[PDB]
Design a protein around this ligand. Sequence first.
Ligand SMILES: Nc1ncnc2c1ncn2[C@@H]1O[C@H](COP(=O)(O)OP(=O)(O)O)[C@@H](O)[C@H]1O
Ligand SMILES: Nc1ncnc2c1ncn2[C@@H]1O[C@H](COP(=O)(O)OP(=O)(O)O)[C@@H](O)[C@H]1O
Ligand SMILES: [Mg+2]
Ligand SMILES: [Mg+2]
Lengths: 274, 274
Amino acid sequence: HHSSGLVPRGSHMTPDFLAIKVGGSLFSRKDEPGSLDDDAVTRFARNFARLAETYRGRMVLISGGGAFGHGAIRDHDSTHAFSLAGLTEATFEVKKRWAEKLRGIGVDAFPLQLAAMCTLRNGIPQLRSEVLRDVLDHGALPVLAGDALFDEHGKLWAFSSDRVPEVLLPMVEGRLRVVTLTDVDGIVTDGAGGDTILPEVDARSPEQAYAALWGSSEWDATGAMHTKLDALVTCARRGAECFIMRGDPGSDLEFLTAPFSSWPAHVRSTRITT
Amino acid sequence: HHSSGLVPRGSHMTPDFLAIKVGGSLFSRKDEPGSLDDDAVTRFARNFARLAETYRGRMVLISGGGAFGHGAIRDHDSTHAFSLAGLTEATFEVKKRWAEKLRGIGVDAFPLQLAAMCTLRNGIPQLRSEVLRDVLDHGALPVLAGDALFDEHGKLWAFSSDRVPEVLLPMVEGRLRVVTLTDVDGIVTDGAGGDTILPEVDARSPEQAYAALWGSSEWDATGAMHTKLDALVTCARRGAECFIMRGDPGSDLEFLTAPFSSWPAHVRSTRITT
Ligand SMILES: Nc1ncnc2c1ncn2[C@@H]1O[C@H](COP(=O)(O)OP(=O)(O)O)[C@@H](O)[C@H]1O
Ligand SMILES: Nc1ncnc2c1ncn2[C@@H]1O[C@H](COP(=O)(O)OP(=O)(O)O)[C@@H](O)[C@H]1O
Ligand SMILES: [Mg+2]
Ligand SMILES: [Mg+2]
């Protein structure tokens, strides 16, 4: 036994940190190049702004790649992994669009290139720049996304926005809450369209959640729901309280500041914890 | 006296590392939003590619901001320094354009956001990400530019591409050569259009070079030739061999691999050294 700080945890406790990921499904048609739904971005931005005021210096916003990101991966030459470099430019564009919009409504939103801050070592992302912590300590809102990351052999890999919360794990003090907004209400069990949402998944033994999953579409290059589950199990096994739930641009999100047991009764999600 | 490695230096010696900065003047009209001269970019790229093959893992390309960068600074609200955040998006675009072009001709060019890697402390830029060194060690070509950088108090500052070589100084082993390509042949002495180029400046006492300088235009927000001189004096006082010289998109640049005393006789520059 190595000693560590005892962190009080539970459905009664308020999060110390929010990592909110917004799926591309919610503001982009993957099929349509350069699709960004500015109305969706605008409306979501307003809701993210309120969260960012409360979680000042205690939140990151993570954007999916949409048409920009999936397109970069679709269109690269798999025979030279370096052609994935275009992915970093593509996901920068999406971070830019979020950050611009947020700054227009008074949020100190700053896009950061994950590829400039993180590399892979034995498959595990490694935060290698102190700048993310400084930005948060200045009270700003980092806008992040997935990226093309170098490994220790110099090979580029496509690293989904869904996995970005993993990079926060050794950095974030106290209770991390990770919320992945998507186009489904959570992990649906008993049907490749629907039956019922699985309300709780135990990250120590999530075999039933994995049993529920179905395929990625043709348009999807980063593994859809399986990649989400893998990332959120990873985060939950390191103490995070994680959620898959439905995004909606005008939906109020202030309940994401609140302890889970105090959430409104209408809110549906899959919660992943240990 | 603290001991350090004795580095052989002189006009007879070949550089171990090349930092090539390409001024916005050379591929953008600052006055014209979104001006990027694709023919200039294409032609320069071809010449930079040959350098990058020889200096594989031993070179950075640094782009000026042109219309994108100067525009971001022109158009920000000086009453909230955070509105400078748009600068990081603007100079990312320019890095993207270079990197795209270079990759199209077989160079492993990867844009990196300086703001994600570097902060200011007591006015001195501090490299805070290990990713730049890794990228170079993988044999890739970092494409850099100026940026909006956070200081230790959370204030954003516009940091010119001209100063980017300063960030390399504690990282680069051996002989660094810094070449700033601009729209003049060097530091002109005896006239606010021309008289003669100052061929050599001693960084230990460069008072005559500073005496030669004239103003920034209306369009220029990062201090024109004075900022170049300040950056290159800084680098030279830490051992770099620095050059201000004229850029031209089709000009062959292979002589930039070569010891200074072996350069062609037609080449004009201001050389700054200690
Ligand atoms: N068991 C499941 N429950 C819910 N969604 C699932 C399941 N299995 C696969 N999926 C798919 O995962 C999709 C969400 O992932 P994805 O398409 O990548 O969206 P995002 O844009 O949020 O990353 C859903 O639209 C659904 O089609
Ligand atoms: N003594 C000098 N010698 C040469 N150029 C000078 C001098 N003083 C000022 N300058 C100005 O500096 C300019 C180059 O800096 P700048 O406009 O910022 O170009 P860049 O795009 O390379 O950064 C020249 O075009 C010139 O007008
Ligand atoms: Mg996805
Ligand atoms: Mg300049």
